[PDB]
Amino acid sequence: MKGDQKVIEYLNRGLRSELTAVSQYWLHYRMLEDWGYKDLAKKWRAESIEEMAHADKFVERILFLEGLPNLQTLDPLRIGQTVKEVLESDLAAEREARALYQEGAAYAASVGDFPSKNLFEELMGDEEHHIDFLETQLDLVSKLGLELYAQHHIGKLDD
């Protein structure tokens, strides 16, 4: 069904934002695993896979509106080199994603494309829940110090 061009442009911007998050969180998952924080690595793997589902929803909506999904490029990755930098890098990215979806939802609403608007609002609520998770981890790091926070999430040793 032919969609509004500008809504499709917002969908493609959101697709790029998710593709960035998928790779940033996957590499952070593998970094946390390499540093030994297996329980943080678990959660980051799961979070990357949630971003993969978001990416796929934008691909599907762009095609239905007869647009061309563009997976060629990512936004710049922010890669942390301590557990606190990983938290701060992902928080920054998620704040940008939330602001993009807020704008995409408002634009879609303005042209009557209510299903695209509900897609952006659903994604904006999901990224606010991830923001809430990341802010809570940074709150623990500030109250306990980074070492006590990270040590609690080393996890169990593999059989």
In the bound state, the residue with its beta carbon closest to ligand HEM is 52
Q: What angle, 0 to 180 degrees and rounded to 10, lies between the N-to-C axes of helices 114-144 and 83-110?
A: 160
Looking at the Cβ atoms of 74 and 138, the one nearer to ligand HEM is 74
Looking at the Cβ atoms of 71 and 99, the one nearer to ligand HEM is 71
| C-alpha–C-alpha distance, residues 157 and 159, integer Å | 6
Amino acid present at 46: A
Q: How far is the CB of 148 from ligand HEM (least distance, A)?
A: 30
Q: How far is the CB of 58 from ligand HEM (least distance, A)?
A: 8
Count CB atoms within 10 A of the CB of residue 142. Answer: 11
**How many residues of this chain interact with a second copy, rule: CB under 8 A?**
67
Looking at the Cβ atoms of 13 and 23, the one nearer to a second copy is 23
What's the chain's length in residues?
A: 159
